[PDB]
C-alpha cells in the first residue's frame, strides 16, 4: 500500500516543508500509470527563498534503480537544466539503500554539484505524516543566532551537544542540514516535559 | 624545588631505536647475574635499574627500595628484531608499499576521503600482488604470513619464495617518505620504521623483582644474543647457514614470548580480573582495616557500631599536637600502651621518626607539631562495609561504640541498621576501618554518615524502620485491647516504657501511682518531639481476615494529629522499614534523616520494654487445626480433585477441545492447574482454630512482621500444587512418568505435583520429593543472582561512569553533553516526597466550584483560574501522550515532587495565633501578587540569587524544569485554599518552599552514572535474561527473540465490538503459501497426473485468454492445497491465484476447480549472469523458495495477533478524565511498524513496538530514546528504580544520534579517545595496540583514566577547587 | 563433637574434639550408625529483649 | 583422579564424604532428578 | 628516526579569566561537597598551624572547622572552573563562603 | 554459630547470667532463647514438633524416634503433654529475670536438640595496623589474615566511593594505605624523571638541560603498569596540568 500513501504524504511533506507546488497534481491512477511507464514521478516545489525543490519517487523495480546507468542519465539531465535548484529528494524502496551501486552514483553527482543537496531516502520516511505520530516529540529548528547565544550563556561548542542526523525522519520533514540546531521538546515523567538542542550532523547516506 | 603537577592527559604512542637508546640508563653487556653480595655491573640486575633489595641503593637516583620506581635499560641486539605487538601493523605496511623504491603503489589520492584511522587498513585490504610500480617499476610481489610462527612474512614473487628478515624489513621501510604515511592514514610518529627493533629495552627491575621467571626469559635472551655475529648483514635472497637461522628465529621467538606469550609475559599480567588493571590498580590491598562477624545489639542506635576493645587497640588514629588539644591528648599519652585508652606511636617533626610508646626515652616530651597515634573510643567515626558493596548504603559511616568486654569479638550493630548492608546474623562477616586522617575524618562524618541513606537513591523511599520485634511489639503496644481487658499500664510501667530510649523522659508528675495510662498516650509522649499529621489504614486490617475475624474499630485506622496517636495500631504499613510514607518518612521530611534514625531507635525501646512485660512466643499447637476444621479442609481439597476428576473424564471421551493457537496438551494442562487452585475460603477453617488475639504465628503474618497468608496455609492447611515455570510438574521419568512411584500417563492429580498434606500433617515420600524439587530450583535460580548481574553490573558501571554533574547541572562526559539537565528535573532522588495534583481528574464544572474564587470581582481571580485549567490541560495532553506510546502505561494524577506544598500550608495554618480571619481585600490582593511573582521566579532556583535580582532572562530548559512545582503551587496556594493564611504567614511558606527546593537539588560534580548503574542493576537480581541483554547491547530487529507489537483500531467508534477486532486480527497475521500447502512435488507424465491432464483439459476450456505461454520449458511444480485450513481462515481461491501472479510474473498457474499446477519460463533463468554455476535443479528450487515466501495475505513479521483489552484514559463532553476499560487492540508477535502502517484498519499514528531497532530506523533518536525507558521499565518490574536512573540509560545509549551499546563497541563509539578507561573493561592489550599505532591522546577525566594513572577522580569533593583568601588573611591574621 | 576416638594420638589441623555430647531425645534411624554430637538444650521461644532478632539467640552464660 | 582431604569435622561428615559422588546446562545438571528417589538423597547438596 | 620527546610540547600556561560577581550563574549555595571539602581543608590546615579567628575554644581541628563554616570565618575561596578555551584561558568563578549559604551537616 | 536439626541456625548475640535469664514457676530456665520470628517463613516444623515430643520425654523418662516419614499426630502428642502433667501447648508462666515480673503470655520452653557449628569467631576475626608485609611488585599489602597483610578494598567498593563522593576516603585508603608514592615526570617531555632532594639530583634524561620536573601523586602498581606498557615498545608520555596565571 505504500504508493497510495506516498500519494498522500508527499504532498503533505511538500506542505509541511513550506513548498508551493509547480504543477498541477494528477489524479491517483494518473500517478501510479507515470511511476509504472515512466519510471518514476517528479514533483516540483518552489521554497520560500525561491528556490527549486525536485523529489523523484521511483518504483520498486524501474531501470534507475537495478542500474547504475539510467540513474547517472538521470541525474545529469535532471542537473543541468535551467533551474535554481535547492535539493533533490530521491525516493526509493529500502533494499535501493543496501545496494552499493545507486549510492556510488548519489555520491558522485554529490561531487560533480557541491551547490545542490542530493539526498535518497526509503519508502517508509513518506508513508505517514511524520510529525503527528504519538512517539516522536515534537521537533523545531532553531536559527543560527539564538543557537550563539544559547551556547554563549552555556560556554558550549556545537560538538558539545546531543547530536541528530540529517536523515532523521522528523529532521528530513523539517529539512534540516548538517550544521543546524533543532530545539526538541519532549514529555518527561520527572519534570512533566523537557527541552533539548540537538546539533544536525551528517546524514545516514 | 619539584613542584606540584597533575597529568592531564596521556599520549600513547610507538617507541622505537631512538626512544630506547635515550630513555635507557645503561647498555646490557655481559650474562653475568652476580659478581659477589651486589649485582654484576653491566648485567640485567645492575643497579643502576633500580634496587629491589634493601642493602644497597640505587645507583641512578640514590633512592632506597621503597622510593625507587626502577629505570630501564639498553640491549643492542645483534640482529634486528620485529616489534611483536605490532606485527599485524607490520603486514600491513609490507603491502602499501614498493619494496624496491619505498614510493606506494596503491593510489594515494583515493584513500583521502575516509577517516585517518581506518584508510591504511582498507588501503592494505585491496589486492596488491601482481602489481607494478611508477617511479622504478618493479612488480610488487605477494607478502604471506607464515603458519609456524607469529612474526615471519614471506615475498612469493610469483613464486620466487623469500624469508623477510628484519634487517631487510628495515631497509624497505627506510625509503617510506614521510608524506606517503602523512597522506595515507598515519601519523609522523608512526613511521613504519619503527617496527623493527635492533635496541630493545631491558625493563627496570622493579618490574621483575624475585631476583621470577621473567628474568629467565631476558637471561635467556642476552646468551643468545651474544652468538650472533657482530655485524651480520643481510642481503634480499642471501644464502645464510641453518645454525645462524636457527639463532635469528630463536631469539625473535624469545622476544615475541617476553610479551606476548600466552594472552610468564609482560602482557599477560594485565587482562584478566586477577590481573594488573582490575586487580592491582583498580582494587586495593590496604592497611589500618578490620573485619569480624557481625551480631546484634538493640542497645545501639542505628548510626552506632559496636567495636571490641582488643580491635580498638589494634586500630589507631593520628592526632596532631597543638596548642588546643596537649591537655586532651596527655592522658593518651601516659597511658601508653598498657592502660585504655592509651596510644601507640608517636611522630617527632624535630627528627622526623616514629617512636613506639614503650621503648620510648624517659626525657620524652609532646611537643606542638608531634602526631599521636592514640587508641580508638567511644564517639569516632568508622567506615562499615559489606560486600557485595551492590549500592552506595553499602558502606556507611558510624559512630564507634568501644565494648569493653574482652570476650566479645563482634561487631554489634542495630537490627534496624542491617537494611542499609542487606545483613543478616546468620554468620555474615563486615569490614570496618577508622579514618586517621583529618580530611578522611571529615568527609566521613560529613557526607558519608549513614542517614545520608536513610533514603534510598534507587527508589526515593525509605530504607529503615521496625523489624520483627518492633513491628510485632508496636502492634502489641498501641494494640487497644489485651487478653486481659483494656491495653493499659500504671504510672511505674509507663515510665518504664521510657528508661531505655535514651531521650529525654517525659514528665509524669500529673499521674497518680494507680492511674493507667493507655499504651497509645505512651507512644504520643515520645512523637511529641517531632509532631506529624498520618493517616492511613495499618496491615492490620486485611480483607482477607475481614469475614472470619472481629476487628475493634479504633484499631483498623491509624491516625496521628501533631504527634498524638488518636487511634489505630502500629505496625509494619506505619512503623516498618521500606514503608514509603510511614512514620519515619514523615518525620526524616520534616526534621532531617537523623532525626528520624533517633526515632526509630526510640520506638524501638517502647516496642521492646512493652513486650518484656506482655512476653510473645510461638507454639506447636499455634499450627495446629480443629478436628471440625480438618474435615473442612479435607472438604475443600476433595472439591479441588473431584473438579481435576472431571477434566480427565472429559479428555477420556474426548470432549476437550482448546481455542485457536492451543494444542490439547496445553489446554488440559490450563485446566488442571486452575482446577486445583485453592479458594480463598480456605482461611475459614484456618481462622476458625485460631485466636487472633494470642496466637502468636497469626500475629507475625497479620502485622505483617514476618511470614504471609500462603506460609500459614501451607503450614496448617495444604500446601496445593507445585508450580515450577508456572507449570505443573513435567514427566521426566521415561516418557509419561513424572516417579517411579506413578504409573505411566497417570491422570491422577498427585502425579503431578497436587501435595494433599500441610506440612504439620507431614508429607509422603512422593509430595517430599515434589517439594524437594520446587525447592532446589529457588536454590539455582537464587545461585544465578550473583554470577548473572554481576557481569552485567560492570559492564554497565564502565559504560555509565563518565557521566558527572556540571556546574549547570548538566550531565556531560567531560565536555560533551549526555544530559541538559539531571533528570530533567535537576534533583536528588533522595529529595523526592510523591504528591497528588488534585486537578488532573476533575472536570470543568468541578474545577469551576472547587477552585474558582468568586469573592472579589476582579480580572485577576478570572485569570487565577485559567492557569488551573491550562496547567490541568497540559499535564492531560502530556500523559495522555505518554499513556499512547506505551504499552500499559496510565495516567496517574500523582507525581514526585521535591516539596510537599500542601502539607507546608497545613502545618502553618495549625500553629497559626489567627482563626478564621475576616475579610480584607487588600490581604487577599497582595498574597495573589506574592504568589504570582514566586511563580515567576522560581526557576531561578537553578541559577542563584544574584541573577534572581538582576532579572536576567532565563533559559527556555529551565523554565520548563520548574513546571511540576509551578503547577503544584498554583494548586495548593490557590485562593480558595490561602483565605485563613496571613500576608506574613505566606512570605513564611514562600521561603521554606523555596528553601526546600534548594535542597533538593542535584550536586555538582556528582557522579551519577554509577548512581543509575548501582539503581537499575539491583532490580535486575529479581529478574539478566535474553531481554535484558537485547536492551543494553542494542540487538537489531532480528536479534530479537520477544518481539511484539500493539496496533490500535481505526475508530475510537468501533473499539468497543470485540467482535470486529477479531476480524483485523485474522487479517494482519502472516498467512504465507506454506502452511496453505498440505502436499507439494516438485518436478506421457508421472503417475497419478490424469487427473493433472485432466485438469489441462477442463482448465484451458473455461477461459481460452490464457493457455500455456510460449515460454515454458521443462518444470511441473505441482502443489495441492489443504482445505481445511481455507476454511479456516476464510481464503478464497481467487485470492491465492490473485496473489501469485501479481507478485511472480514468471509463472502460469492453470488453477484448476484443490490442486495447483505451477509452470514456469526460460525468461526466469539467463538474467543470473551472477551466478556461473547456476544448473537447473538449484534455480528451480531457488524460484519455489521464493514463491514459497509469497504472502497470500497479512503484514510480513507479524506471526500471531491476539485481541487485548486496553485501559486508557479519555476527557468526556464535560472535560472529566475518565478511565475505559472497554477497548479492544490487537497485539502481535513480532514487529512490523511500516508494514501496520500500509494498513487502514490500524492507526498509524499510535502503533506501538517493543522493538528499540525498530523505533529508531522507523521514527528517530528521540522516539528510541523514550522505547529505551519504556522496555527497561518493563524488566524492572514493580520495584524497579527512580525514573531519572532509567533516562540515564537512554539519555547515554542515544547521545551521539543513534542507539549504542552498553558494551566495548558501545563505549569505543562513545567515548573512543578515552583509551584508558577502554583497556580497563575488556581487553588492554588488543585497546593498547591500536592506541599505540593512532597516536592516541587521552585526556584524563572520568573515574578510570585517573585511577589508572594513580591520581583521584575530580568528582565529588575535589570537583570545586580551594584557594585561599589572601585579602581575608592579610586583613584579620598575622605572621 | 567426638570428631574421631584417636585424637589424642593425632596432630591435626583446625579440629575441634567436644566433651559432652548427648544422645536427642526424640532420636531418629540415623543415630544408629553415627555418633550424635549435640545437647539437648533448653530453647524458650520468646522475644527476650530484642537481642535474638535475625537469626542470633541469647545463650546462658552458666 | 577427582581426590579430596578427608577433613574430619565430625564422624558425620567422615561418613558423608566417602558416600559423595561428584561430576542453562550448568543450572539443568544441578536439578533434582526424576531418577534420583532412592539412589541419590533428594535433599542433601549444597 | 626521532623521539616522541621531540615534537612533544608542553601544554602553553594559562590566564585565569575571573568571571565578575554579576554575571556569576552557578548557585550561591555551598553544594554539600564544596562544604565538606571546606571543611576538611580547613581542618588540615588547623592540624598545621592553629591560628584561628574562632572566638570559641574547642579541642578538635574538625569542631573549630565546623564551627568557623558555620559562623563565617573560614579564610577559604571556593573556584568553579567553568571552562578551558583553547586560545588558553580558564574562565572560573569565585565564591566566598562567608557569603553564600550552607547546606545541611546535621 | 548454632544450629538444631532442622536447619535452623544462629550466631550467638548475647549471654545472660543465670538470675538475668527467663524462668518459668518451677523454676526452668532456657539455655537458648531463639526468636519465634524465625519460623514463620523457614517453616522449619519439625524443630516445634521435637520440643513437643521431647518435653513429655524428658517427664517420662524415655527416648523415642522421630525418624522422618513415620506416621505423627501432633494432636495426639499435645495430649501426650496434657497427660504428663504440661499445657497442651507446651507454655508455661514465665517470669522476667531481671525485673522479676511475669509475662502475660505463656511462653513456649522444652528441650530442643542444638549443635555447634564450626565456625568459630576467633578465626575470622582480624585487624590490621597502618604497617605490616608489603607485596615486593606492587607495594600493596600482602593478602589476607593469613600472610599477616591487609584486607581489600576492591574494584565495587571504589564505585561506592565514587558514588558518595568520598575522594579523601579514596586517597586515604588507596594511597596512603595501600601503596601510594610520588612520581616525578618532566614538563618539557612528559617522561619520568630523577628528582632525589637529599643527594641532590634533579635531571631528566630525555632534556638535561631543559629539565623542569613536577612531583604528580602516583601509586606504585600504576608506575608498575607505565613500565610493564613501555616494556612492550608502547611509549607512555604524560602531558601535566598547564600553569595558571592572574592577569597582570
Ligand atoms: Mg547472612
Ligand atoms: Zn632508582
Ligand atoms: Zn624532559
Sequence with gaps: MAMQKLFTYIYEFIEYRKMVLLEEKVPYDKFVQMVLNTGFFRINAETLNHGIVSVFIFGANGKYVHHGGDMRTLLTNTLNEKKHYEELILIVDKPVLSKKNILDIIVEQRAANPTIVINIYPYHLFCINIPKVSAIPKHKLITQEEAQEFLGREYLQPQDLMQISASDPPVVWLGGRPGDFVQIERPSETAMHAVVIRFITKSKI | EAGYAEIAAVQFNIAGDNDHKRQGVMEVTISNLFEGTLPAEGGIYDARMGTTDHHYKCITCSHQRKQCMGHPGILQMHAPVLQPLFIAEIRRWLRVICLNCGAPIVDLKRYEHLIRPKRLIEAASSQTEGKQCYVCKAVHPKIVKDSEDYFTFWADQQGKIDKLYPQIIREIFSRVTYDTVVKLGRSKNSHPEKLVLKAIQIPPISIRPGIHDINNVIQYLVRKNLLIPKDLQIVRGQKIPLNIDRNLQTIQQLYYNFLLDSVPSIMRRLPRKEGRIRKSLLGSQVWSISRSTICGNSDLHLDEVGYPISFARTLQVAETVQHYNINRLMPYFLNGKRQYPGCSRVYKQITQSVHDIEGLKQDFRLEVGDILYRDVVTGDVAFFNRQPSLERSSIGVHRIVVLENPKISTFQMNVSACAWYNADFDGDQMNLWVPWSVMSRVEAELLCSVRNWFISTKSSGPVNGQVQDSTVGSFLLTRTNTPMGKNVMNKLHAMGLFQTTQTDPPCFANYSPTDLLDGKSVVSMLLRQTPINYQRAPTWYSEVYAPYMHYNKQDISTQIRNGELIEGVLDKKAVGAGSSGGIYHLISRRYGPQQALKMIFATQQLALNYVRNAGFTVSTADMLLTPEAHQEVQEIINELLLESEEINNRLLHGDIMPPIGLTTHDFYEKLQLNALKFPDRILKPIMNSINPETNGLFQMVATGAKGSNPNMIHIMAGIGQIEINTQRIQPQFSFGRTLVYYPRFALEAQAYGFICNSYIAGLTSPEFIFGEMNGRFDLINKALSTSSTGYANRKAIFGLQSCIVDYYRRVSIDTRLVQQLYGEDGLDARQLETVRFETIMLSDQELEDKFKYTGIQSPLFEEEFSRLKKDRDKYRQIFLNVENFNFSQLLTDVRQVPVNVASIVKNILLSSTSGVLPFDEKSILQKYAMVKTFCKNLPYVFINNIQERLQTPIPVYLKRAASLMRMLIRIELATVKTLNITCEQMSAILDLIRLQYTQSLINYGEAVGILAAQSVSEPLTQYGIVRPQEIFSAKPVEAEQSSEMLLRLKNPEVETNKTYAQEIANSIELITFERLILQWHLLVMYPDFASDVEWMTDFLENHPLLQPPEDIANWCIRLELNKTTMILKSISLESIINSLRAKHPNTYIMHSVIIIRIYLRESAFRRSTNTRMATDEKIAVNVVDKLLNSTIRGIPGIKNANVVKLMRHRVDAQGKLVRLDNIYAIKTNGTNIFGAMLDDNIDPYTIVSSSIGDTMELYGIEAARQKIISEIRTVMGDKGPNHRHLLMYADLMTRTGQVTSLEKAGLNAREPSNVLLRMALSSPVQVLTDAAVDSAVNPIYGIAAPTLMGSVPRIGTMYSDIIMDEKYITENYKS | ?62 | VSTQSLERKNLLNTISALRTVNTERADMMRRVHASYPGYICVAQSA | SPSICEGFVQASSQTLVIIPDNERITSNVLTTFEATRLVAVRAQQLAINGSTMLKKKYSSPIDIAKQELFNRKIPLLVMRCIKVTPEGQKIVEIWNPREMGIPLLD | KMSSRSGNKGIAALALPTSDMPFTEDGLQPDLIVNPHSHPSRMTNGQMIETTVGLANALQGVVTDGTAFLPINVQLLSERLAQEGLRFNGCQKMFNGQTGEYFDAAIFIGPTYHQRLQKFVLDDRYAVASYGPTDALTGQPLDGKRSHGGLRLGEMEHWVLTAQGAMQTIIEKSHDDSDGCISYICRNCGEPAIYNASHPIYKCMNCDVQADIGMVDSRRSSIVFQHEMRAANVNITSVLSPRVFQPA
Design chain 3, 1 to 62: 563433637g567426638w570428631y574421631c576416638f584417636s585424637w589424642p594420638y593425632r596432630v591435626d589441623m583446625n579440629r575441634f574434639f567436644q566433651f559432652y555430647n548427648e544422645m536427642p531425645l526424640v532420636k531418629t534411624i540415623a543415630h544408629n550408625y553415627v555418633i550424635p554430637n549435640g545437647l539437648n538444650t533448653i530453647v524458650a521461644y520468646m522475644i527476650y529483649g530484642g537481642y535474638n532478632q535475625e537469626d542470633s539467640v541469647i545463650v546462658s552464660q552458666s
